[PDB]
Design a protein around this ligand. Structure first.
Ligand SMILES: *CCC(=O)N1CN(C(=O)CC*)CN(C(=O)CC*)C1
Lengths: 18, 175
């Protein structure tokens, strides 16, 4: 589920997978 | 002059680092930017307390290397920038290593690791920087040796910071 906060501004760029 | 033993930013996300515990904790994040794949090892469990999150490298064959240089680039987010935001939040993480003649494979073995240092950011990420869409990249370097065994691991412990590793470069110097 991971609803944790954004680590840095790079996260604003869409498409991140975990 | 620098012989590279490990290079996380270049390794296309395929090194099979080991996380303890499980998949809560450090998380491998992938995106493509400027038609170049990009990897961050990230953890940000600042809300719940008692965080003990470990990340271990692949085993590195030391070879000729007797002193290694560990260059890290990372972000750390300001503990006051969390709407809500706990008193479990921290702004440092710990760097460890372990020498062995033997792969551990999959039993993590934190007890065999030696602390190199507390890693602290010169540049803390604040809510302003999300607005500018600009990254404060910390660069820190530590040295360890002499190394005398077949190989070594690096490990990272998070105890409740909001950290992203962008680069972990391990080298030795040949003159
Ligand atoms: C707490 C980290 C996390 O899982 N998420 C925040 N986030 C980022 O930090 C992206 C840089 C967005 N998330 C994901 O990408 C989840 C895979 C959620």
């Amino acid at each position: 589920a991971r609803d944790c906060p954004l680590v840095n501004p790079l996260c604003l760029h869409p498409g991140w997978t975990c | 002059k620098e012989v590279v033993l490990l290079d996380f930013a270049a390794a296309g996300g395929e090194l099979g680092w080991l996380t303890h515990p499980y998949g809560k904790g450090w998380d491998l994040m992938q995106n493509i930017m400027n038609d170049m794949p990009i990897y961050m090892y990230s953890v940000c469990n600042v809300m719940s307390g008692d965080q003990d999150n470990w990340l271990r490298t692949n085993w590195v064959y030391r070879g000729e290397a007797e002193r290694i240089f560990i260059e890290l680039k990372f972000t750390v987010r300001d503990c006051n920038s969390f709407p809500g935001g706990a008193s479990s939040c921290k702004e440092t993480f710990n760097l460890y290593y372990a020498e062995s003649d033997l792969d551990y494979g999959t039993n993590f073995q934190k007890r065999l690791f030696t602390k190199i240092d507390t890693i602290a950011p010169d540049e803390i990420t604040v809510s302003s920087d999300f607005e500018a869409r600009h990254v404060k990249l910390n660069v820190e370097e530590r040295s360890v040796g002499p190394l005398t065994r077949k190989g070594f691991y690096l490990a990272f412990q998070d105890i409740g910071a909001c950290v992203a590793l962008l680069s972990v470069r391990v080298y030795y110097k040949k003159c």
